[PDB]
């Protein structure tokens, strides 16, 4: 007996199903580490991360909500992106879009 214990049924949860995704190779050319959140508009991340910013337009990381991907200086890796939904309007970040798309 453990007070308030969970009895989680075994299995897995499929995240962001039925949505467009794409893979992109990213490389940190800066001398300081960069960490990106699950819902940040990838096309507007720190300029030191080199990748096809055009392909990442309207996309965010396809990872569980609230988690992140870290890039140490010089680190190169391939990440999977998932398209934004809702109104597909991007406001904020580095102020590159500030509107629909």
């Amino acid at each position: 007996m453990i007070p308030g214990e969970y009895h989680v049924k075994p299995g897995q949860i499929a995240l962001n199903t039925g949505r467009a995704t794409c893979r992109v190779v990213v490389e940190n050319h800066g001398d300081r580490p960069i960490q990106v959140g699950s819902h940040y508009h990838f096309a507007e991340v720190n300029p030191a991360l080199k990748f096809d910013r055009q392909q990442a337009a309207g996309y965010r990381l396809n990872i569980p909500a609230g988690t992140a991907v870290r890039f140490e200086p010089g680190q190169k890796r391939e990440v999977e992106l998932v398209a934004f939904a809702g109104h597909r309007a991007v406001f904020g970040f580095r102020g590159e879009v500030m509107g629909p798309l």
Binding site: M1, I2, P3, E5
Partner: protein
């Protein structure tokens, strides 16, 4: 004495620990509040003695064992935190999984 609110608040913790201390002495298995108070009071005295935060983070995991507390209690206490005046001022001691 000019006791500030925080000093008086800690007197409440000290007293709660006296209660637990006497019960443990009788051979009773401690419950949730008694366990938290006993381990916390232990740390506060460690700081008064001049022990380091690092030493206490370790020693605090050896005050009570799973056989001295009620069932489920160890799981109700994933960690214990308490602050006290060390020789170098107030510091926070965090003891992870204190009861095993």
């Amino acid at each position: 004495m000019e006791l500030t609110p925080r000093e008086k608040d800690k007197l409440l913790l000290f007293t709660a620990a006296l209660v637990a201390e006497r019960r443990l002495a009788r051979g009773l298995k401690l419950n949730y509040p008694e366990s938290v108070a006993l381990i916390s009071a232990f740390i506060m005295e460690g700081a008064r003695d001049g022990k380091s935060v690092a030493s206490l983070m370790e020693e605090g995991r050896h005050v009570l064992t799973r056989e001295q507390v009620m069932e489920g209690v160890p799981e109700m206490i994933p960690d214990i935190q308490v602050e006290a005046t060390f020789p170098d001022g107030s510091k926070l001691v965090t003891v992870h999984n204190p009861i095993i």
